[PDB]
Design a protein around this ligand. Structure first.
Ligand code: HEC
Ligand code: HEC
Ligand code: HEC
Ligand code: HEC
Ligand code: HEC
Ligand SMILES: [Cu+2]
Lengths: 471, 190, 254
């Protein structure tokens, strides 16, 4: 039997997705405030709040915990339905992935503030945690790929192409970038296998591809399932799906050196990164086109359905960032952009605008269904959430652009006499209003997250036994 | 097609995804420019190595870059643009990604130890406008150096030229200052 | 539309958008062009282009502003402070250079703080002359009496009180007699008697007015106990600029 879809894990992951979203974004707001007012840092005593330590916590919680859980819930729900079979690992393998993932985030929460970090971005957790994550991910791929193997229909939905790719590539990236000799039990009590330029390359190959697969590909899978899930029928382009997918999947791995522009990294590598990052523009947009064009005719729905609003706007930000990224990947542009708040602007445009928004919409869609509910408790709240999230994202982006341009310019600016026009401190001071506005925008987005939490909770209350009949 | 075939799709994906990594990462292992240390350079002294770990633990990297780009203005501000050879020993590499604070790569003497102590103790005190967090605990905690030998041994395994003699021979604030003082020094003297 | 449905979802067989195609192809073409043009070429740079552009940037900068610096170098530091052409451009830019390099220790104002000298004022530890200031800048930069058996716990207190009297007048009679005697013995050698101080040593005058230095009895006790040990790092490596800065610092007082 077991004809019914295993909703179990998806339910757990969805709720946790909301929870981690709140935790991660709140850390985001707090650290932002710390940039605005350093007092928020403990003056005497490292303690609980210190920016250097908290920052990676924000990073990991937001990406792996929030984004990660979103990916788990979405992939488990989506693959099951798209292929029409009950999850291959079942409660056992899949639930293991749930608890295991939970353990991973919990360990991050304890470990990071404690000070144990490799110092490698998006890599920060210590080796023991790395082994745990590798194990959980291995289990996760078996469940997912197994689900595909067990499918009913002969064809495999493109959404699964993206999810599947994301799964495999992240595993490879994680293993490779994490090679390190353990000196001690924890924290970064390991030293990376590589050093210098090589370490930088491995790091950014890993680092970009992280957003590339974890944040883009996997989420593209989400978009592929959820955007078309609507009352309106067909409008899409399958051939684009094919071109866009392969081209993206191939091209994206080359993008690593754009991080490294005008650094110690050899010129040839930097160039390869730039060129491929520019080629990357097309496939990435292919995703957005495929998503949006699908809406055509359907647009009237946008006023009606806020979940749709979220998905659509999500693609808007996605395209924007996928455009801005290639531009910043040009050496001349990077010359200005690098080390400035602009990089952050770019990150949150994609993070809040694309990743968060699509996952949000995804959850609003799925959680009622998984919960054995016709719909969310209040649509109005989804709308309010939509607005809060949108203004917050835009405010964040605007502030960062102003700050970033100001910083790059101020840093580079030379006088008539040839001397440096501004002290670094002057640039720092210039940045303050930007820091505050950013703090506010992020705060608003966070509030939207709270509204989501309230709404979801209300809906969650309704029924025990929410097997949703056959499905 | 290959739409239908799970194994084929998986294999092609793994293959497609691999090319960039093989093309970019692998050749670097082989290239000498990125491998060769500056001639003068030696590995971090045990105090400096410990301090570097502290710099890692604290999260200094999150605000401070250690990579000078080859532009005139940054050369003017920071000093000689960073060279691959400088980072040869760095497991893991410290190059920044963000400059909330200024670039640290070449503070090969720029400030006195005393200044560093006061500043780390309370950045606002020395630089009123600073965003930097206060790190007074550094003064509070002493180093046991139990682990230092293990750390150097591991680094040697990794390729760092520590002598047996170096291992045998080997406050946190002291270590951090020691680390900061070495940065970028290797190139200038050599 | 295509025949197979994936739970609700069906997909249209549609063509790639022409513009999308064009942009994709264009990017590819640009990439090939870039690679041929970059490392594998472009004209303008002999050999092969690289980060080598750095040299060009510096070189053109040098051509453009070499004259200004070169003119200044011939001129003496005193002259470079006076003259608003070089001299005034030397204060604003020297002042420009000052902010970037010096401000973090000596204050944006150049007024200084505890542990760092006030460059604006009249008082100079190493000497106010142009040569002295220049030397301070170019080549960069107090004995622990607590230990020297004789000084001890009490001797230090006494000397501190006496110095505060040289600087002004507090009231402590034991802390005065003893201190006078000690100062004449030891301190006076570097700080002189009546604390004129000696510029050669960088020993500051004890007969000063209220400055940023820890005048308090306790602070004086600490400096006497433990001694000083302050550094002015050399700008000869890091820094022409040193000269303009000397001209600026000199201009600062007057
Ligand atoms: C922190 C590391 C400093 C740097 C950066 C700069 N200065 Fe400095 N300077 C510093 C100290 C602690 C002292 C006092 C040293 C002592 O005798 O205890 C000084 C002294 C000077 C002087 C001499 C002043 C005098 O009384 O004769 C000059 C002229 C001076 N400093 C200039 C100067 C310039 C131009 C700087 C930027 C290039 C600069 N200093 C940086 C500490 C520090
Ligand atoms: C984020 C906020 C940080 C944190 C995590 C660190 N620093 Fe910094 N730092 C920051 C700013 C905005 C500034 C400029 C204002 C100031 O000088 O106080 C600095 C400055 C420094 C400097 C001086 C650099 C220079 O002027 O050449 C140093 C040496 C420095 N910071 C060191 C340092 C260390 C060791 C850190 C980890 C404990 C650290 N910083 C963290 C902002 C931030
Ligand atoms: C020989 C060298 C001596 C000796 C024998 C004494 N002093 Fe000190 N002193 C000396 C120098 C070069 C400096 C400057 C230190 C620095 O700038 O880092 C000082 C400084 C002091 C100060 C501090 C002045 C200030 O607050 O800026 C004091 C209070 C002082 N010296 C006192 C002092 C006393 C009481 C001595 C006899 C016990 C004495 N000095 C001897 C150089 C030298
Ligand atoms: C991926 C999802 C994601 C979400 C959602 C997110 N962030 Fe971040 N955040 C990141 C990443 C990635 C970085 C690291 C950027 C870098 O290393 O350049 C970061 C870094 C930051 C920083 C450090 C900035 C700096 O200059 O060092 C702040 C502040 C911040 N985020 C605030 C926020 C706020 C406020 C929110 C409010 C919702 C938020 N974040 C939500 C991903 C996210
Ligand atoms: C989350 C959504 C997201 C999307 C979508 C995205 N990136 Fe980014 N981008 C990031 C993050 C996170 C960083 C910061 C990495 C770091 O910490 O240095 C970044 C930084 C960058 C930088 C600046 C690196 C530096 O330090 O100067 C470039 C260039 C870049 N990305 C290119 C791209 C390209 C090319 C694409 C797609 C074609 C893209 N981005 C899409 C998240 C994203
Ligand atoms: Cu990237």
């Amino acid at each position: 039997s077991k004809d019914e879809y295993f909703d179990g894990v998806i339910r757990a992951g969805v709720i946790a997705t909301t929870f981690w979203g709140i935790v991660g974004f709140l850390v985001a707001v707090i650290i932002a405030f710390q940039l605005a007012f350093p007092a928020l840092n403990l003056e005497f005593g490292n303690g609980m709040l210190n920016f250097g330590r908290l920052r990676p916590l924000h990073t990991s919680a937001v990406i792996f915990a929030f984004g990660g859980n979103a990916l788990i819930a979405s992939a488990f729900y989506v693959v099951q339905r798209t292929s029409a079979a009950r999850l291959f690992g079942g409660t056992a393998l899949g639930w293991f992935v749930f608890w295991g993932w939970q353990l991973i985030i919990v360990t991050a929460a304890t470990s990071y503030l404690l000070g144990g970090s490799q110092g490698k971005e998006y890599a920060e957790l210590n080796w023991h945690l790395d082994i745990l994550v590798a194990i959980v991910w291995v289990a996760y791929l078996i469940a997912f790929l197994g689900t595909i193997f067990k499918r009913k229909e002969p064809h495999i939905y493109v959404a699964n192409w993206f999810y599947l790719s994301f799964i495999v590539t992240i595993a490879m990236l994680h293993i490779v970038n994490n090679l390190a000799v353990p000196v001690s039990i924890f924290g970064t009590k390991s030293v990376q296998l590589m050093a210098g330029v090589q370490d930088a390359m491995t790091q950014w190959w890993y680092g970009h591809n992280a957003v590339g697969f974890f944040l883009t590909a996997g989420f593209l899978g989400m978009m592929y399932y959820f955007v078309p899930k609507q009352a309106e029928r067909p409008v899409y382009s399958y051939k684009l799906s094919i071109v866009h997918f392969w081209a993206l999947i191939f091209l994206y791995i080359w993008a690593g050196p754009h991080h490294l522009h005008y650094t110690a990294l050899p010129d040839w590598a930097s160039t390869l990164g730039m060129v491929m990052s520019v080629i990357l523009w097309m496939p990435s947009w292919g995703g957005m086109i495929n998503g949006l064009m699908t809406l055509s005719g359907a647009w009237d729905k946008l006023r009606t359905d806020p979940v749709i609003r979220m998905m659509v706007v999500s693609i808007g930000f996605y395209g924007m960032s996928t455009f801005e990224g290639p531009m910043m990947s040009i050496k001349a542009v990077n010359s200005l952009s690098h080390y400035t708040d602009w990089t952050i602007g770019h990150v949150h445009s994609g993070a809040l605008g694309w990743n968060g928004m699509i996952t949000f919409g995804m959850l609003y869609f799925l959680t009622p269904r998984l919960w054995g509910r016709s719909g969310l408790y209040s649509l109005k709240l989804v709308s309010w959430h939509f607005w809060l999230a949108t203004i917050g994202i835009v405010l964040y982006a605007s502030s960062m652009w102003v700050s970033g341009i100001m910083e790059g310019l101020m840093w580079r600016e030379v006088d008539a006499q040839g001397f440096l026009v501004n002290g670094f401190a002057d640039t720092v001071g210039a940045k303050f209003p930007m820091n505050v506005v950013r703090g506010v925008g992020g705060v608003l987005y966070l509030t939207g997250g709270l509204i989501m939490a309230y709404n979801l909770w209300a809906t969650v209350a309704k029924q025990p036994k929410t097997a949703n009949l056959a499905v | 097609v290959l739409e239908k075939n799970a194994t084929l799709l998986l294999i092609f994906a793994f293959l497609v995804v691999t090319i960039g990594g093989i093309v970019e990462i692998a050749p670097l292992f082989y290239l000498e420019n990125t491998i060769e240390k500056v001639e003068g350079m030696r590995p971090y002294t045990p105090l400096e190595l410990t301090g570097r770990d502290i710099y890692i633990r604290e999260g200094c990297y999150v605000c401070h870059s250690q990579m000078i780009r080859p532009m005139r203005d940054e050369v003017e501000r920071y000093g000689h643009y960073s060279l691959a050879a400088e980072s040869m020993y760095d497991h893991p590499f410290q190059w920044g990604s963000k400059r909330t604070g200024p670039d640290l790569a070449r503070v090969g003497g720029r400030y006195s130890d005393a200044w560093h102590v006061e500043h780390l103790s309370n950045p606002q005190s020395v630089v009123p406008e600073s965003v930097m967090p206060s790190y007074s605990y550094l003064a509070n905690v002493p180093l046991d150096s139990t682990w230092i030998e293990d750390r150097v041994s591991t680094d040697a395994l990794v390729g760092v030229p520590y002598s047996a003699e170096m291992i045998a021979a080997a406050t946190e604030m002291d270590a951090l200052v020691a680390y900061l003082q070495v940065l970028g020094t290797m190139v200038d003297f050599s | 539309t295509t025949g197979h449905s994936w739970d609700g979802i069906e997909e249209l067989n549609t063509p790639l958008p022409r513009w999308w195609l064009w942009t994709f192809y264009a990017t590819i073409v640009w990439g090939v062009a870039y690679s041929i043009a970059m490392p594998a070429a472009t004209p303008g740079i002999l050999g092969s282009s690289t980060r080598a552009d750095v040299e060009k940037d510096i070189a053109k900068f040098a051509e453009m502003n070499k004259a200004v610096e070169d003119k200044l170098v011939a001129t003496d530091l005193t002259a470079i402070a006076a003259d608003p052409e070089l001299v005034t451009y030397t204060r604003n830019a020297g002042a420009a250079v000052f902010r970037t390099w010096c401000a973090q220790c000596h204050g944006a104002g150049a007024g200084g703080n505890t542990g760092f000298p006030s460059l604006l004022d009249g008082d100079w530890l190493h000497g106010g002359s142009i040569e002295t200031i220049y030397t301070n800048i170019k080549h960069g930069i107090m004995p622990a009496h607590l230990t020297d058996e004789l000084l001890e716990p009490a001797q230090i207190d006494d000397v501190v009180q006496y110095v505060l009297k040289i600087s002004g007048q507090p009231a402590d009679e034991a802390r005065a007699t003893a201190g006078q005697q000690v100062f004449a013995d030891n301190c006076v050698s570097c700080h002189g008697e009546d604390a004129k101080g000696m510029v050669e040593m960088g020993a500051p005058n004890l007969t000063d007015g209220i400055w940023l230095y820890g005048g308090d009895a306790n602070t004086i006790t600490t400096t006497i106990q433990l001694g000083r040990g302050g550094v002015m790092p050399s700008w000869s490596w890091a820094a022409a600029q040193i000269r303009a800065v000397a001209s600026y610092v000199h201009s600062l007082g007057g």
